[PDB]
Structures are given as C-alpha cells and as structure tokens.
Amino acid sequence: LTEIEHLVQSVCKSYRETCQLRLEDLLRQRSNIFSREEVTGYQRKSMWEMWERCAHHLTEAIQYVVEFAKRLSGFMELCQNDQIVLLKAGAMEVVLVRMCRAYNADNRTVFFEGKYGGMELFRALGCSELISSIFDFSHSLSALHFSEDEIALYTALVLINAHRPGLQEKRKVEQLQYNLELAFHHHLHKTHRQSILAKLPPKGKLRSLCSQHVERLQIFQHLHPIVVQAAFPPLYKELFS
Numbered sequence: 001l002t003e004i005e006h007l008v009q010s011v012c013k014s015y016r017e018t019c020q021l022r023l024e025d026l027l028r029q030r031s032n033i034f035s036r037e038e039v040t041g042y043q044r045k046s047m048w049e050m051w052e053r054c055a056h057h058l059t060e061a062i063q064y065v066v067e068f069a070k071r072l073s074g075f076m077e078l079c080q081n082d083q084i085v086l087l088k089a090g091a092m093e094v095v096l097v098r099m100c101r102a103y104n105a106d107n108r109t110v111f112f113e114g115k116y117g118g119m120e121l122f123r124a125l126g127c128s129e130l131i132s133s134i135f136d137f138s139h140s141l142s143a144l145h146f147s148e149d150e151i152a153l154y155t156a157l158v159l160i161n162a163h164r165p166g167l168q169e170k171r172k173v174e175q176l177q178y179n180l181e182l183a184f185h186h187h188l189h190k191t192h193r194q195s196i197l198a199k200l201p202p203k204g205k206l207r208s209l210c211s212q213h214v215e216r217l218q219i220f221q222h223l224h225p226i227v228v229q230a231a232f233p234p235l236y237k238e239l240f241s
C-alpha cells in the first residue's frame, strides 16, 4: 500500500480521537429539543453568564482541534513558529466547519448543553447578525452531508495551508499540504464523492466569518475576562492579552 492510503487512515484516526462529539450521538439526539420554557431560561440569563458558558465551550472545541493538528503526520516536525501560525489562522475555521455535524438543517438547531436549540437560544449575547451568519454557514455545509472521513481530510487541509502569512518554513508546510490534498482527492475518487469539491465553501468566506467571530470573542474577553483552562502556552499567548 502507498504512503497515501496510510495517510488517509492516520488523518481519520486523528479525527476519530479528537472529534469531541460522536456523529451517531448527535444524530440520535436530534429529537431532544429545548422546550419553550428552557429557551426562555437561556434568553433570560445574563449576557455575561452566556458569554462565560459559550467561551468555555469554544475554548474546549479549539483544544480538540489543537490535539487533532498535533496528531497530523509531520505537524510536530514543523518549527513552533509555523505550528502557531497555522493554528492561529485555522483552528477556529475548523471549529466552524465541525459545527455542521452538530447542526440540524430540518429545524435550524444546534446541539448545545445537551439538547438542540435555535439561534434564539443566544438572544442575551446581543450578537444576532453574527450568530445568524454562523448558523447560515452550517446550513450551507449541512447540504453536503459530509462523511466523517470527508470532515477529517477537509479540516486537515483547512489547517495545513502553506499560503498562511508568516510561515518561516513554507516548503515544509507545502510538502504536508500536497500529501493531504492527494489523500483527500484519492479518497473522494474512491468513494465517488468528487462532486463535493465544487460545493466546498469559498476560502474567503470561511476566513471572513472566522475573523468576525474571533473579533467578537476578543471584544467580550476585553469587557469580561474569562478563566481559560490553558494547555498550549504559545497559542494562548497569541490570542489572549
């Protein structure tokens, strides 16, 4: 067998070990929807309590993406500068892509704190336009019916992007990128799923949405600093201040 069949297996294993929520659990829980009373309870919470909760969940989500990256063949052999450039630019883009597995397009709900709720759950945060954009992005991705292996290989390429500004060893990132591109393309051909390539989000759209999301998180962190369960000092240092 080729390096490439092994690389598909190792990327998918890295994803399985770090996916955070199991797809089978997410799909089984779709009928478990917050009641009108439970939605009102969330809408009445303080902006600042909803921010603490959401910030904790998002921090956590990012940490699973860091663990995913650490398991990607060659990622740990990149210099620390380049690891941090890639994670800073890509880890929240990966969280936004990972959201589609936890999103039900039939009723426009997301799995949050054990049940599915709509964007109105988050009313107290006063972010309706941005949250609507995040839901809309998941709605767009939901139409692809991404397999678990498609998510794994696609999100590896969201991270391993030799075009990110500020890389010091661009050729080393290019080598990992080309092998992951070949892995993804080989896998789509074998599964008769090449049709998804034309349907993937424009890179500018994911970048713009991620930038808007992180900017809003930065504003909340400035107004109301959180306690972070920090595991990755070089990455923490780049995002928190």
Ligand SMILES: O=C(O)c1ccc(/N=C/c2c(-c3c(Cl)cccc3C(F)(F)F)noc2-c2cc[nH]c2)cc1
Pocket: 055, 056, 058, 059, 060, 062, 063, 087, 088, 089, 090, 091, 092, 214, 215, 217, 218, 221, 226, 228, 229, 230, 231, 232, 233, 235, 236, 239, 240
């Ligand atoms: O364990 C660690 O060391 C560690 C380090 C950093 C982490 N995340 C930083 C976040 C946040 C963010 C979040 Cl998730 C919540 C509240 C406030 C923020 C803020 F914006 F303020 F940074 N948003 O984007 C990123 C990010 C990370 C990579 N690219 C983007 C998470 C855990």
Ligand SMILES: C[C@H](CCCC(C)(C)O)[C@H]1CC[C@H]2[C@@H]3CC=C4C[C@@H](O)CC[C@]4(C)[C@H]3CC[C@]12C
Pocket: 019, 020, 021, 054, 057, 058, 061, 095, 096, 098, 099, 100, 102, 110, 111, 112, 122, 125, 127, 130, 131, 134, 213, 216, 217, 220
């Ligand atoms: C869109 C809403 C609100 C965003 C509020 C804002 C703009 C202040 O960050 C966020 C809040 C919590 C987020 C989830 C946290 C954890 C996960 C698990 C991960 O595997 C996939 C993504 C997901 C479901 C996040 C989706 C976006 C959520 C609901």
